[PDB]
Amino acid sequence: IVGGYTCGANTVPYQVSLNSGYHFCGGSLINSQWVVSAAHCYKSGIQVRLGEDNINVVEGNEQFISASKSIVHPSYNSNTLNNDIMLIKLKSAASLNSRVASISLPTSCASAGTQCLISGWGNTKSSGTSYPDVLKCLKAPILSDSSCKSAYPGQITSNMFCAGYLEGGKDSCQGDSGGPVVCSGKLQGIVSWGSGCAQKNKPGVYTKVCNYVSWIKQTIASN
Ligand SMILES: *[C@]1(=O)[C]([C][C][C][N]C([N])=[N])[N]C(=O)[C]2[C][C][C]N2C(=O)[C]([N][C]=O)[C][N]C(=O)/[C]=[C]/[C]([C]C2=[C][C]=C([O])[C]=[C]2)[N]C(=O)[C]([C]C2=[C][C]=[C][C]=[C]2)[N]C1=O
């Protein structure tokens, strides 16, 4: 997260870290044993880390659970990152408490101008390389589709939305992928991609979760 702030320990209880010897992607806990993340973060043998704040120091509050199965969306396209979403079933159900809790799926899509909270352990520099120990947060609005389409000509699908600042300065970045974009208490997006980080007229692009609620529920009810 570039231009964000320290969230505060366990203030974003649904945020999870996807670890494979190191943090590589984020994710969101939507059920005691299901987390949603980006399809492009797919890896075999993923250990999900819940109740995490400082990813580099064991603070005793966290839970480490291996992924039982990863289900990538049937129409995921690596060439365009369209349908960049995947469900991960946990090997064991998480102990939901105050420091660990699931986030609700949306009932309708969020409009442009809606303020959301984006979080993750990704790079904090536009140019440099600096990964934070503690979780970073950022408040950013959902941008209009026209603005999104003009920033990324011919690259935006109906399953993506832009969020952030058109003048740059604040944005998600490498390492935030798969992470949550929560608006008014509902998970509306998943960190997907962008051209650089925090660049003028190059806002972050996120998977539009509201288009996959039926798929998510059905997948959970049959797996
Ligand atoms: C995600 O954390 C990022 C989020 C970027 C948000 N940016 C923003 N809001 N402005 N997503 C990406 O990097 C996506 C997926 C792949 C292509 N993406 C892009 O945004 C690219 N855009 C234009 O070129 C730029 N991305 C990169 O170059 C990312 C490179 C690194 C290193 C790397 C890893 C695997 C490769 O095959 C090539 C290069 N990738 C990351 O940092 C990943 C996390 C990761 C994945 C696998 C192993 C290790 C780390 N970050 C994300 O996917």
Side-chain angles (χ1 to χ4, degrees):
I1 300 289
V2 178
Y5 57 95
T6 301
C7 303
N10 302 317
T11 58
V12 187
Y14 51 79
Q15 172 87 226
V16 313
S17 171
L18 301 190
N19 189 281
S20 57
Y22 57 89
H23 167 87
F24 65 98
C25 280
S28 301
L29 189 67
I30 58 167
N31 179 263
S32 64
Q33 52 183 341
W34 288 93
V35 334
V36 59
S37 186
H40 83 251
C41 289
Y42 176 80
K43 273 187 179 179
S44 297
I46 295 174
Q47 184 188 63
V48 176
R49 301 194 171 191
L50 307 293
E52 203 70 288
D53 187 42
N54 182 331
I55 47 172
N56 292 312
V57 177
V58 171
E59 302 178 80
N61 185 95
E62 54 286 282
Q63 304 177 222
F64 300 174
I65 309 176
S66 298
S68 180
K69 65 197 300 179
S70 295
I71 303 167
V72 177
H73 190 268
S75 296
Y76 169 60
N77 185 202
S78 59
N79 304 313
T80 60
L81 290 188
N82 191 21
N83 306 298
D84 193 8
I85 182 172
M86 97 174 150
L87 287 168
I88 299 171
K89 184 180 183 178
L90 301 179
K91 187 181 179 179
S92 324
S95 309
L96 299 187
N97 57 97
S98 35
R99 294 82 107 218
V100 178
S102 55
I103 188 63
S104 291
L105 279 330
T107 40
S108 46
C109 303
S111 323
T114 299
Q115 207 67 32
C116 311
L117 183 74
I118 306 178
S119 52
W121 290 277
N123 192 7
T124 59
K125 296 181 169 175
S126 312
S127 63
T129 306
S130 186
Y131 288 80
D133 285 346
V134 293
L135 187 62
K136 311 309 270 204
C137 279
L138 175 67
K139 290 192 178 69
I142 293 176
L143 301 174
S144 64
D145 293 323
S146 54
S147 301
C148 190
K149 292 178 176 178
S150 45
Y152 295 109
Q155 301 182 94
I156 303 301
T157 69
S158 48
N159 304 306
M160 299 169 188
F161 70 81
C162 287
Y165 301 81
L166 288 181
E167 296 312 315
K170 307 174 179 300
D171 193 4
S172 52
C173 198
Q174 272 63 51
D176 291 319
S177 289
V181 174
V182 176
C183 320
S184 295
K186 309 305 169 69
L187 177 68
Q188 295 282 176
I190 295 165
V191 185
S192 188
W193 63 280
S195 192
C197 295
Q199 299 303 295
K200 174 176 170 69
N201 223 61
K202 291 291 173 282
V205 185
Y206 306 84
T207 309
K208 188 185 291 185
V209 174
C210 66
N211 287 172
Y212 305 89
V213 179
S214 297
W215 175 67
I216 289 173
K217 291 185 181 173
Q218 184 55 203
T219 303
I220 293 181
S222 48
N223 283 269

